[PDB]
Each structure stands twice: as structure tokens, then as C-alpha cells.
Amino acid sequence: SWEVGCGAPVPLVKCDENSPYRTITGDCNNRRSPALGAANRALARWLPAEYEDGLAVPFGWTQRKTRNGFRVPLAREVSNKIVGYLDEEGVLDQNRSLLFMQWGQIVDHDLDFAPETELGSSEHSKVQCEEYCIQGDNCFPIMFPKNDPKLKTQGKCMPFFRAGFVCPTPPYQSLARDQINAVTSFLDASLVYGSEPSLASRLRNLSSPLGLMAVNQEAWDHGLAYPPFNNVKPSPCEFINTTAHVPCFQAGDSRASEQILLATVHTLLLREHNRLARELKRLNPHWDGEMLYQEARKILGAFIQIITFRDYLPIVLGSEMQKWIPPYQGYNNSVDPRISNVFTFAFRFGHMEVPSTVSRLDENYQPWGPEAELPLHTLFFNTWRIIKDGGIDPLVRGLLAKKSKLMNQNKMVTSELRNKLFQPTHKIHGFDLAAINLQRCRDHGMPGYNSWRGFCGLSQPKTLKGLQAVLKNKILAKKLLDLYKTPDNIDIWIGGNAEPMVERGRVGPLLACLLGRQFQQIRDGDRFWWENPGVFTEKQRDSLQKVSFSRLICDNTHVTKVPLHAFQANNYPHDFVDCSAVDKLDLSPWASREN
């Protein structure tokens, strides 16, 4: 590094070296370096940051500053020319359920968050950014190109605030700026429990010694729990329907209500903790609240790791799974567990897997009611459609029986995200997630497409003809090179996602390498990885081996018809069985005769 020891929140970290449980922060996982993978630290840099000043200024900031002798294109122009499409017909993934998309977003939220600069206080600064489109300090607005329809309806820009960074802010260091990871790098259910002590405590039911998570007191789903409401104002979930007045959920991760299927899977996970905490209390009436909370927590962390490494990563990485994530050979304390800055963009492949609609299905997997299918844009920050329109069950059936979107070089990101995104504090369904992704690549100082190709041992196309061959597409390579005059300048998010998918996978060679390395490291560099000797007993592991998403549904909803392989495209009733035919988590090996 340029100057080490610039980590302000490094201290106040006590390591009980015999504790059988993870910290909330992720401190004390690595014994020799105890901050490694802990929250509220710098994202790791796999390659030096690239900024137009070599330190923090993002490419695209200064009109008269080139990248490699060319102007970088406007993020929104890249979005309009390359990313957008009109026809949703034929865009669905014939072999991935909608759950495939949704598990991706859940795993992402466990691993990484780079919060926008902390400028919540009411200020003319928001006005200078949103109203006047003035680029300065944290405001780095997404300017509309000529002939952008949004010019006619929304003004000259979309507001965009720079990501927060480590080390004091105005006293910025002379090392290049590093954005923060606000959650734990470990795959540890931090999205359920939180990554900070305050929130972890607020989420818990301390009113009784049962090791329960707090549940909603104002609303229930046929006797099953909802998460508590976030009772701080203003609330974006209230803002999208001021008649319903249904706030956002409060969970371990601040983004839990961003869309209704994310809030859905959070509700399943919360329910599973309290189900585990109740069953643990029955098997061990002696155990106190703290031990019931910790033991349920450790079980839920192991469930998330198994679904992710056994069911999810193999059908993302396809042929490349074995090359980057070979069979576990145990905990390696030399491995860096930190999430990389580049991974936070590589894992944004899910955005091209989001389809244009969400469905509510009844017990026969037929349309639930007469508004059963809803445009996705109406479901950002939407809790009221869960609380007041049928609970979780209909949305869970949609997750099983509907398909993910397939990424397509011609049809990359649905207009529901590309033109109609709602951002809290922006009060309009008018934002562009693709343009935001590209602006954020530049904000975070990302090296370009060919730097990452090099990193991954892959060819670095220099010509139109070279880029055609790597993308296997003539027209997409021409459109990219018309905006970015050299492949060296292509932003990693659009470059990575433009590559044709590997055999049996859903990402191309570059993303398979960036994702594969990151997931290898979070497994190998985790002292509390479930399969690491000593973390669980052998008998605990033979039990954990039989977890499944279908089982999580069976145990936490009144859905009684599930598929055996919940990530593949499943149709009702042919691919569906009764819950009785799905393996159970045998909790008999957590029976502690402790006398």
C-alpha cells in the first residue's frame, strides 16, 4: 500500500480466540490479521485504481481529459445504444427459475455494499445535484446525450452521488481513493443479522430469553412472521403509496425492500432463524437466549454457504466452476477473504437476468387474482403489495414457476431497470441502473476491459476485428468501438457482460474468472466455513448436506408443492412434488446432553 495504518475503525476489536461464533463485524476471523473481511473497511484492490488524476478523480469528470487519448462516452449514451431493447418476447431463460436471479441478489447483499457519500442532511447540495445538474465534490451527475427522450421529460441529468471512501474524507490520503465495503466479506448471513453491533442488537428479541429475531407486531402472514418495519422518516416504501402507509422492512442489510422478491427472500430467512431458535430450545431447554441466537445464526450462515456453493455457483460458472472453485481442501489463513472492488461490478451480471414482470400464483400455480402479473417498476420499495395483497406464498410460487431473464447481447437490461428505476430520495420512476453501473465503475476507479482480460490470462483485443472475435458478434463490437474508440476504454461492467456465456454457465470467460477467484477466496479464507473441521461436528454436517431452497420454502410458508431442483426452470405440476418428498434438516445432532 502507499501508507498502511490509515484504517480509523481498526481498533476496539477484541478477539475471543476460543469463541465458537463469528463476530457481527467479521473482525477476528483471520487470527494473524484480524480486520481482514470485516465490515466498514476498504474494498480490496486486485489492480491499482485508475482515475484521471491517479488518485480519486473519476474518468469522464473533466471534458478535456482523455482516457488513452479518447473521450469516455456518457454512461446513458452507452446505456441507450448498447444496453436497451423494446421487445420482452423470447427474452426468458428456458433453464433458470426466477429464484436464480433472486438468490444472486441475496448473495451479493451478504458480501458487499459501498454506501453513497454520507450527505443525508437536508442541503442545497442535493438541490445543486438533482435540480441544476452541477458536477462538483460528491455530485457526479449522469448527463443525458442529445436526442435522449428523458431530455424532454426529466431535465438534463439523473443525479448520482459518489461512493463513500476510507481514511478521513476532506483529509483524503495520497494513496488512490478506496471505496468502503459496509458489510462483512464472509458469506455469513450478515444480510439477516447485520454487520454492526447497533443494528444486530436492534434486530434481536431480547424481551425474552429465546434467541429470537424481532418480528412485525402490526402485521402477520397467515400466522407467519414479517420482519419489523423501519420507523424512520422519510420512508421510500411509504412514498410509493401514501394511501397504504406500509413502511420498508428492517433487516440485517439496508437494501432489503429494494424490490418485493428481495423482501420475500429476506422474510423466508428471518422465519428460518426463529424456526431454528424454537427447535433448538425444544432440543436444549437449558440453553440461554445468546446461545440460541448464535447457534441458529451459525446454522443459517451454513445454509446460505451450501445453497450458494452447491446449487448456485455451478450454474453461474458452468465449465469454469472446477478451474476456479475446486473441491474444498480446508481453511487457508494465507488467503485474502476481502471482497474486491471489481467483484462489486462483476456480480452486477444479475441485472441482465431481471425480467420485466413479477407474478403472484395461487395453490394451482395459476394467476393469483386479476392483477397477478405486475410490471417490476411498480415493485421497487413495495411492501404494501406483500402486506395487503396475499403475503409471501403467491410471490414464492412465482419465484419457483417463473423464469429469470436470459442475458442477450441484443437485449441486455429490461427498461423496467434501464428507464424506470426508483431511487429513495429521488421520488421518480425515471432512473437507469445500467448508466448508474457505468458511472459507478468510473467513480470506483476501475481499470478498463483489457486490464481485466490481462488479469485473467485472456486475449486483449486492440482492433474492431479482434473485439468481434472475442464477443462473437460483429454489430455489438462495432457499437462498443463507435462509443469507446479502443477496447482498453470499455468499462468493466459492460465489457464483462458483453462476452458470450461459457458452456453450462450464465457469464462469459472474463466474469467467470473474476467471480470464480472471489468465491474461491471467500470459501478458502473463512475460518468459520461450514465444512472446516471443528466448526460443525461430522453429524451436524451430514444433516446440513441435505438443506435445500425447496425445504426452506416448505418449512417457512404454506406452499406445499415445490420442485427438487429449485434453480432450474420448473413447470407445475410435472416438475413439482409434495413437501413430504423433500429432505429435512435433521436438527437431532444439536441435541446437547451437557451434564
Ligand code: HEM
Ligand atoms: C430487481 C432486481 C434488482 C434491483 C432493483 C437492483 C438494484 C441495484 C441498485 C440500485 C444498485 C446500486 C447502484 C449504484 O449506485 O452503483 C445495485 C447494485 C448492485 N447490484 Fe443490483 N439490483 C437487482 C438485482 C441484482 C442481482 C440479481 C444481482 C446479482 C445477481 C445484483 C447485484 C448487485 C451488486 C453486486 C451491486 C453492487 C453492491 C455493492 O454496493 O457492493 N443486483 N443494484
Ligand SMILES: *[C@@H]1O[C@H](CO)[C@@H](O[C@@H]2O[C@H](CO)[C@@H](O)[C@H](O)[C@H]2NC(C)=O)[C@H](O)[C@H]1NC(C)=O
Ligand atoms: C395503494 O395501496 C392501496 C391500499 O392497499 C391500494 O388499494 C387497495 O387496492 C385496491 C383499490 O385500488 C382494492 O383491491 C383494495 O380493496 C384497496 N384497499 C384500499 C384501502 O383502498 C391502492 O391501489 C394503492 N394505490 C396505488 C396508486 O398504488
Ligand SMILES: *[C@@H]1O[C@H](CO)[C@@H](O)[C@H](O)[C@H]1NC(C)=O
Ligand atoms: C418477543 O418474544 C415474545 C415472546 O415469545 C413475543 O410475545 C414478542 O411479540 C416478541 N417481540 C418481538 C418484537 O418480536
Ligand SMILES: *[C@@H]1O[C@H](CO)[C@@H](O)[C@H](O)[C@H]1NC(C)=O
Ligand atoms: C494457502 O494460500 C496461499 C496463498 O497464495 C497458497 O499459495 C498456498 O498454496 C495455500 N496452501 C494451502 C495448504 O492451502
Ligand SMILES: *[C@@H]1O[C@H](CO)[C@@H](O)[C@H](O)[C@H]1NC(C)=O
Ligand atoms: C438445465 O439446467 C440443469 C442445472 O440447473 C442441468 O443439469 C440440465 O441438464 C439442464 N437442462 C436442459 C434441458 O438444458
Ligand SMILES: O=N[O-]
Ligand atoms: O439493491 N439495491 O439497492
Ligand SMILES: [Ca+2]
Ligand atoms: Ca457477509
Ligand code: NA
Ligand atoms: Na440502527
Ligand code: NA
Ligand atoms: Na437500493
